[PDB]
Amino acid sequence: RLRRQPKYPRKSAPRRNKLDHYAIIKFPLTTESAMKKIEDNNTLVFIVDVKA
Amino acid sequence: PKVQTDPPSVPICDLYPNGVFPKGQECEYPPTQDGRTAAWRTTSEEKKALDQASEEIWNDFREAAEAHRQVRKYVMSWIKPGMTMIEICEKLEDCSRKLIKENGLNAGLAFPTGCSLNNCAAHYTPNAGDTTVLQYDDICKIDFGTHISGRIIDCAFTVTFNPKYDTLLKAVKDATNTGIKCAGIDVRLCDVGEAIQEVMESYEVEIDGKTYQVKPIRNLNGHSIGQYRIHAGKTVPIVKGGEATRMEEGEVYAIETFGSTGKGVVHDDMECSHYMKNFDVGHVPIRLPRTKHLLNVINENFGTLAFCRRWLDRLGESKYLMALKNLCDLGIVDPYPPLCDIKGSYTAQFEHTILLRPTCKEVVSRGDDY
């Protein structure tokens, strides 16, 4: 069984990574319950992409 | 009784150890009684007797106004283009603190020093890191206030360097003076708005080859001052068609007047810096320790008077604007973000605090400068 050796790439260029770190973090959250976590738990709350 | 040094440092009370402070401009109330003049109360009848019953209250306004006069003369002495307003505000505040010899809430600054540039109108002071250099082609509204035992005096003027603005300055000054003389006892606020609009609109401004018409900022208006309460709940308008409420004996008023070469209305443009605890709200629960701590700090140090973020950083408090907006949502403190007109417009303001004495009308904030 021979490994495929294409005469040409079917896709001209690799697809760009459209889900990057700036896409990972949407924005921080500022609700009242959140503030408790930064003070007492040393934890940050974030809204992130659903696919991350 | 000593004298004041060239850089003002002697407290006002030291200049008048006797206890009596220089009186403002005494003016007879307008002859709005259908021609009959009000020059019947100046005689020392029971009117003057009950005027004397509140003499000690007036003296506080007199010393506060004198301190304001010296502070603004000092500011006029050294103000020049090219220096940022962070150090300008620091100099104004420290000079006012030394002249008023603040001690807790018995004496101190009534509200943060507002220095609005160009289209901005009021309630702007630089925050930490605000790098704004002044320019030759700038106009600035220096609004600051001092108080003695809560007797607040509010005064404001406009500084210019390019001589192309003198027409607008004189228009706004004439409007403010007309509002001053029009005010009186038992007169409707709509009348003072009528007078201000009818004096101020009859001026034309020629700036940079473009002819503009100066118009009042219908959004802003004057206000009444109370004991530790800058806004007593009565607003004197500067445009036609207002309320029909009267002004009564024993009240004090800040007759503000704004003029713009723009649209005559303002909105919130940049970051808020002025804040004010509500005089009417009572006890509202808080759930954040930081928020509670900031609340008690501000009510101990600023009470019901207005404050700015510079005054909180000056106290060593950091990481606080969070709990500050938390108090804002809880309704304890109301933010007062800067009010600005259309970009490229210019605004001028002149303000004076007036006293409704039983026998006469004293404009305590009057000075030789304006």
Ligand SMILES: [Co+2]
């Ligand atoms: Co005011």
